[PDB]
Amino acid sequence: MKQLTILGSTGSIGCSTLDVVRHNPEHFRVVALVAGKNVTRMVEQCLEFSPRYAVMDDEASAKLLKTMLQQQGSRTEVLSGQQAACDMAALEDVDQVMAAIVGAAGLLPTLAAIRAGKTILLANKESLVTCGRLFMDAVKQSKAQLLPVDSEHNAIFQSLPQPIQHNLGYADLEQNGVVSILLTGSGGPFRETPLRDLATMTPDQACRHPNWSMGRKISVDSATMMNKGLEYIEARWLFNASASQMEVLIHPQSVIHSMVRYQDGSVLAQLGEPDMRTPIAHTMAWPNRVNSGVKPLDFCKLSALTFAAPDYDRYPCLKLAMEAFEQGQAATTALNAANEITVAAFLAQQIRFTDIAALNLSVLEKMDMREPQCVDDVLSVDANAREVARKEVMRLAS
Amino acid sequence: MKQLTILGSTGSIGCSTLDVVRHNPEHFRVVALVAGKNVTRMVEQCLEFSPRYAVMDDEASAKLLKTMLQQQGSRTEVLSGQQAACDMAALEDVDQVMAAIVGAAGLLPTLAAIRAGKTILLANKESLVTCGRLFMDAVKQSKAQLLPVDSEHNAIFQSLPQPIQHNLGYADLEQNGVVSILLTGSGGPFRETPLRDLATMTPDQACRHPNWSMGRKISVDSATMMNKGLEYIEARWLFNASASQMEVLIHPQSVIHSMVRYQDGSVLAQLGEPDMRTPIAHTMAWPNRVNSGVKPLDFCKLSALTFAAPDYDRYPCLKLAMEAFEQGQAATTALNAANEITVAAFLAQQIRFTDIAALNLSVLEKMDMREPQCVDDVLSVDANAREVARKEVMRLAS
Ligand SMILES: O=CN(O)CCCP(=O)(O)O
Ligand SMILES: O=CN(O)CCCP(=O)(O)O
């Protein structure tokens, strides 16, 4: 049996993970849950799965949680704060850590799992994006295996040969017959919205994906295709791909999740319901398989599958991300940080949908700092870009 | 370097194989070519690749070939007949045998390659279909590895886990996380032809596939979906799949070549240009890859990808094949044999398109023989069904 620390347990991916545990009680045990402020969701999960430990980011949420747990008589112990999360990620009995915190705040707990040599179920793209080569070196240095949970990188992983799967980020694509990695592709809810209407789209419209049901941050990123931008950066580290070994396609139907192009002309792809339980279950059971709760994809009830090149006038954030990778790690760390601040500002009705790409661009220009040489440098660049992004947001606020 | 005997070299798959050798002269050498009666094509191939040996099925064709080769001064030696083909398949220096003869006539040379422990690039579905468990036992008994060349089984193979790839036909699908195998799917050139017009379709119309450019036999089988019927039978042996582990879909665009359904909801698929060089190159280079001459699939210039359940009123041959597998090996051997005779009769303008399924059904009913216990029994059943099918054809001739 394999035992779990879930980072970001109350989130969309966290809840999907627990649903896989739920369907496979004889294969998977949760030792620790880590979350932020959603106390009701966390109390549901603690009462259901009886984890050894539960961590909340702030102490007030931890107290509310503990009060309810000791009333019901739960054996689950409650802690709070970032260091507690890092300790939960490194517990001896833990085999796998689901890294599903949103944003760069997930970085330190994820790195702690990595240093403890844990199998990392990686669903926190912002951490690899913001940390890059330093993240990949921490993985190589330790006994840890990365297993991509994000739907796209998971599909790529499944469609890659074993020498790459077993040496992720360090193996040579070309020697293993890989020509390129095909990153798809939904296009968001406004793929067919007139360009000139984009600025009037509300947070609720942006968070309503036709196919996916995920968190608000990721839904907005899908709308701007910053999600694909972040995944483009991440895929380059995870799979050791150059710019010429990356293609980005829009696939509106979200059936194909991504693909790998080989030298003989073959393209290998993963398909399925747009449901995170599938890629999560893939990583948790790898190299075997388990039921994930997701039913068989019915090919006779599908929409016709299409593809299209991304239009950078529609999706300026994609351009920003792809070019940030070329500009280096400081620009990338700062882009991620800015986008966290501007997406939050959009969701809090402080700026418009199209202001995200505008202010992200502005922050990048105003950033003037050196390439990070360590994790502390990554965090200084992050914190600084957050400060500049907050100032820029105030630039377009009522 | 790997060295080749090609069985059926002058055919569509044979020519596609030689094109892969052509693009990879430093990886692949042809020791022997085996063909039938197409002397011009065979002389082209002998003069180009300078094989050690060339075999033609009849002695008159061998003579015409030899006359031209010794005029030009070629070192290639010419032989004729079936036993010669079997010897070519077992030469010491041969590493791989492309089994690309059409029909059950390919059986004996393919079995000779198998007994010699050769890597079998298997593109002769009629042989496995007609020989079944006996074929798979010959493979298991010897040192031979099957590598499926047919576009569909190749796609399945690429989309299967390594434990299955390395123990093909004997490994358990369910233990390796496989729920089912999804066999696709073109539907032929008459997929959208009114049912009532099918009977007026000519051989030239039947042989014009929108996507594939292959031999006449396989093109007619694609039109009736007997191709899928034969591939259904073959896939059950190759992948150790039961009836409940097989799904058959129409995919009109021939981009997806087939798929594998896993327990967590994942579906793995191979995609590409509908071009046999790709699956051929996959098998020849396995577990590595080579350029096959096929260019990268352009997803931005594709038709929208669709799927549909097969309609047995449109494709009665599919029903015949799927039910023949249940009826056992004699019925299957006899169905294949009948279909070879009736497809030939259709191409020779002796019967109509729709007469293929009718006479195939008739032959099956008239067959009354025991399940084959050995290869000789397989050939008696085959020869007998050919005789009955010829008689039935005469039933509807002018
Ligand atoms: O893990 C799943 N995702 O990343 C969501 C994909 C939505 P997009 O294709 O619009 O980025
Ligand atoms: O190897 C390639 N084929 O089998 C040709 C497929 C044509 P179909 O899908 O109509 O059977």
Side-chain angles (χ1 to χ4, degrees):
Chain A
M1 195 165 313
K2 291 200 128 212
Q3 302 213 89
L4 267 282
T5 282
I6 298 170
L7 307 170
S9 75
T10 59
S12 178
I13 286 157
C15 287
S16 292
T17 304
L18 288 173
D19 203 40
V20 177
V21 170
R22 227 181 251 118
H23 283 279
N24 300 280
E26 220 166 287
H27 296 312
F28 307 116
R29 217 180 185 142
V30 178
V31 167
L33 300 178
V34 176
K37 309 178 176 125
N38 190 344
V39 180
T40 293
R41 185 108 253 169
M42 183 58 120
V43 79
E44 180 230 13
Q45 293 172 171
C46 287
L47 287 177
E48 191 188 316
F49 294 96
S50 275
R52 199 186 294 159
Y53 305 109
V55 183
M56 312 267 258
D57 198 53
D58 64 54
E59 185 179 292
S61 292
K63 277 184 221 213
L64 292 171
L65 173 59
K66 180 62 180 174
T67 296
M68 284 179 52
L69 292 179
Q70 67 172 247
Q71 174 66 37
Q72 187 65 34
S74 165
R75 68 105 174 209
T76 295
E77 310 258 31
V78 181
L79 303 162
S80 75
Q82 182 167 65
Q83 178 56 53
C86 297
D87 291 325
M88 296 308 97
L91 299 169
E92 160 102 312
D93 287 329
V94 168
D95 301 305
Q96 298 179 347
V97 183
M98 171 56 72
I101 289 165
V102 171
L107 182 51
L108 259 26
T110 295
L111 251 24
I114 284 156
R115 282 196 310 285
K118 304 308 186 178
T119 293
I120 313 301
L121 324 175
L122 189 62
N124 173 24
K125 53 179 77 77
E126 291 92 355
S127 279
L128 179 41
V129 162
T130 202
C131 210
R133 176 49 74 217
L134 293 164
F135 190 98
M136 297 305 300
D137 286 342
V139 170
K140 194 186 172 249
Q141 186 176 309
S142 79
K143 295 166 197 222
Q145 162 85 226
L146 290 182
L147 290 178
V149 169
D150 296 326
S151 184
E152 290 80 14
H153 307 105
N154 186 264
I156 288 157
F157 181 93
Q158 287 197 55
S159 303
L160 278 163
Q162 277 208 19
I164 308 280
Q165 289 170 147
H166 285 300
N167 195 224
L168 203 54
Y170 324 115
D172 193 273
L173 290 175
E174 178 159 315
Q175 268 158 43
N176 289 284
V178 171
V179 171
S180 58
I181 291 188
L182 283 148
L183 187 57
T184 56
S186 113
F190 315 137
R191 180 189 70 91
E192 283 180 306
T193 300
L195 280 165
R196 250 120 192 169
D197 296 354
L198 287 183
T200 61
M201 297 302 95
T202 73
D204 286 355
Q205 293 180 296
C207 295
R208 278 180 228 131
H209 208 319
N211 306 309
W212 294 97
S213 308
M214 303 191 61
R216 297 185 84 69
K217 205 283 203 174
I218 210 292
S219 301
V220 172
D221 283 350
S222 155
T224 62
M225 284 200 204
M226 179 56 97
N227 190 46
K228 222 50 44 162
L230 294 172
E231 293 191 308
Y232 169 96
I233 290 159
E234 164 164 59
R236 287 193 65 180
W237 299 116
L238 281 180
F239 307 116
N240 198 14
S242 71
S244 69
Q245 297 175 310
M246 295 292 313
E247 296 176 65
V248 184
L249 277 170
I250 300 178
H251 178 253
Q253 299 77 33
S254 300
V255 178
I256 292 159
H257 294 113
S258 271
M259 320 181 269
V260 180
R261 206 189 281 288
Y262 290 82
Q263 256 166 241
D264 53 35
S266 292
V267 181
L268 300 189
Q270 191 261 17
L271 296 73
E273 289 286 359
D275 194 318
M276 292 303 308
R277 281 128 88 214
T278 293
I280 291 164
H282 167 288
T283 62
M284 285 172 65
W286 183 81
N288 313 117
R289 301 275 180 159
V290 294
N291 181 64
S292 77
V294 174
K295 26 102 213 210
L297 218 230
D298 189 339
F299 287 88
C300 296
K301 306 211 231 267
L302 287 180
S303 301
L305 313 185
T306 58
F307 313 88
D311 174 25
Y312 294 144
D313 292 311
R314 182 170 290 281
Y315 302 109
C317 278
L318 184 53
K319 185 172 171 307
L320 280 176
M322 281 167 77
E323 286 179 24
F325 191 94
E326 216 235 49
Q327 295 171 328
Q329 190 58 60
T332 296
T333 292
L335 181 54
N336 179 71
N339 180 73
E340 284 187 49
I341 294 305
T342 51
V343 167
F346 166 60
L347 297 169
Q349 296 182 281
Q350 291 180 92
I351 72 178
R352 296 189 174 76
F353 181 63
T354 52
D355 294 349
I356 293 164
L359 299 188
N360 286 349
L361 172 72
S362 179
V363 172
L364 283 208
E365 181 59 35
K366 316 239 194 317
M367 287 311 291
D368 197 42
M369 277 177 329
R370 282 178 42 75
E371 302 315 305
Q373 302 307 124
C374 60
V375 173
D376 275 328
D377 290 346
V378 166
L379 297 167
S380 309
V381 176
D382 178 83
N384 197 242
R386 271 173 213 272
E387 189 179 279
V388 175
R390 278 176 208 116
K391 281 174 114 162
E392 289 302 284
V393 164
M394 270 164 30
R395 237 75 130 107
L396 304 173
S398 308
Chain B
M1 195 165 313
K2 291 200 128 212
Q3 302 213 89
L4 267 282
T5 282
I6 298 170
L7 307 170
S9 75
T10 59
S12 178
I13 286 157
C15 287
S16 292
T17 304
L18 288 173
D19 203 40
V20 177
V21 170
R22 227 181 251 118
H23 283 279
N24 300 280
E26 220 166 287
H27 296 312
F28 307 116
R29 217 180 185 142
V30 178
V31 167
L33 300 178
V34 176
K37 309 178 176 125
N38 190 344
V39 180
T40 293
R41 185 108 253 169
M42 183 58 120
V43 79
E44 180 230 13
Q45 293 172 171
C46 287
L47 287 177
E48 191 188 316
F49 294 96
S50 275
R52 199 186 294 159
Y53 305 109
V55 183
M56 312 267 258
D57 198 53
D58 64 54
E59 185 179 292
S61 292
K63 277 184 221 213
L64 292 171
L65 173 59
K66 180 62 180 174
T67 296
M68 284 179 52
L69 292 179
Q70 67 172 247
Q71 174 66 37
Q72 187 65 34
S74 165
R75 68 105 174 209
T76 295
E77 310 258 31
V78 181
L79 303 162
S80 75
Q82 182 167 65
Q83 178 56 53
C86 297
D87 291 325
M88 296 308 97
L91 299 169
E92 160 102 312
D93 287 329
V94 168
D95 301 305
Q96 298 179 347
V97 183
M98 171 56 72
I101 289 165
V102 171
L107 182 51
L108 259 26
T110 295
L111 251 24
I114 284 156
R115 282 196 310 285
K118 304 308 186 178
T119 293
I120 313 301
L121 324 175
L122 189 62
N124 173 24
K125 53 179 77 77
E126 291 92 355
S127 279
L128 179 41
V129 162
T130 202
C131 210
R133 176 49 74 217
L134 293 164
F135 190 98
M136 297 305 300
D137 286 342
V139 170
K140 194 186 172 249
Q141 186 176 309
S142 79
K143 295 166 197 222
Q145 162 85 226
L146 290 182
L147 290 178
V149 169
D150 296 326
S151 184
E152 290 80 14
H153 307 105
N154 186 264
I156 288 157
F157 181 93
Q158 287 197 55
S159 303
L160 278 163
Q162 277 208 19
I164 308 280
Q165 289 170 147
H166 285 300
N167 195 224
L168 203 54
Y170 324 115
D172 193 273
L173 290 175
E174 178 159 315
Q175 268 158 43
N176 289 284
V178 171
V179 171
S180 58
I181 291 187
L182 283 148
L183 187 57
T184 56
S186 113
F190 315 137
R191 180 189 70 91
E192 283 180 306
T193 300
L195 280 165
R196 250 120 192 169
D197 296 354
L198 287 183
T200 61
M201 297 302 95
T202 73
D204 286 355
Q205 293 180 296
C207 295
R208 278 180 228 131
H209 208 319
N211 306 309
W212 294 97
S213 308
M214 303 191 61
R216 297 185 84 69
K217 205 283 203 174
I218 210 292
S219 301
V220 172
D221 283 350
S222 155
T224 62
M225 284 200 204
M226 179 56 97
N227 190 46
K228 222 50 44 162
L230 294 172
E231 293 191 308
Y232 169 96
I233 290 159
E234 164 164 59
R236 287 193 65 180
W237 299 116
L238 281 180
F239 307 117
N240 198 14
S242 71
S244 69
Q245 297 175 310
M246 295 291 313
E247 296 176 65
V248 184
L249 277 170
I250 300 178
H251 178 253
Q253 299 77 33
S254 300
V255 178
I256 292 159
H257 294 113
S258 271
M259 320 181 269
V260 180
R261 206 189 281 288
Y262 290 82
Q263 256 166 241
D264 53 35
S266 292
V267 181
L268 300 189
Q270 191 261 17
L271 296 73
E273 289 286 359
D275 194 318
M276 292 303 308
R277 281 128 88 214
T278 293
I280 291 164
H282 167 288
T283 62
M284 285 172 65
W286 183 81
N288 313 117
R289 301 275 180 159
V290 294
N291 181 64
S292 77
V294 174
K295 26 102 213 210
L297 218 230
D298 189 339
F299 287 88
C300 296
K301 306 211 231 267
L302 287 180
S303 301
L305 313 185
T306 58
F307 313 88
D311 174 25
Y312 294 144
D313 292 311
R314 182 170 290 281
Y315 302 109
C317 278
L318 184 53
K319 185 172 171 307
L320 280 176
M322 281 167 77
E323 286 179 24
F325 191 95
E326 216 235 49
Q327 295 171 328
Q329 190 58 60
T332 296
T333 292
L335 181 54
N336 179 71
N339 180 73
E340 284 187 49
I341 294 305
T342 51
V343 167
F346 166 60
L347 297 169
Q349 296 182 281
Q350 291 180 92
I351 72 178
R352 296 189 174 76
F353 181 63
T354 52
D355 294 349
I356 293 164
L359 299 188
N360 286 349
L361 172 72
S362 179
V363 172
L364 283 208
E365 181 59 35
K366 316 239 194 317
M367 287 311 291
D368 197 42
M369 277 177 329
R370 282 178 42 75
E371 302 315 305
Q373 302 307 124
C374 60
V375 173
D376 275 328
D377 290 346
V378 166
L379 297 167
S380 309
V381 176
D382 178 83
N384 197 242
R386 271 173 213 272
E387 189 179 279
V388 175
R390 278 176 208 116
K391 281 174 114 162
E392 289 302 284
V393 164
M394 270 164 30
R395 237 75 130 107
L396 304 173
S398 308

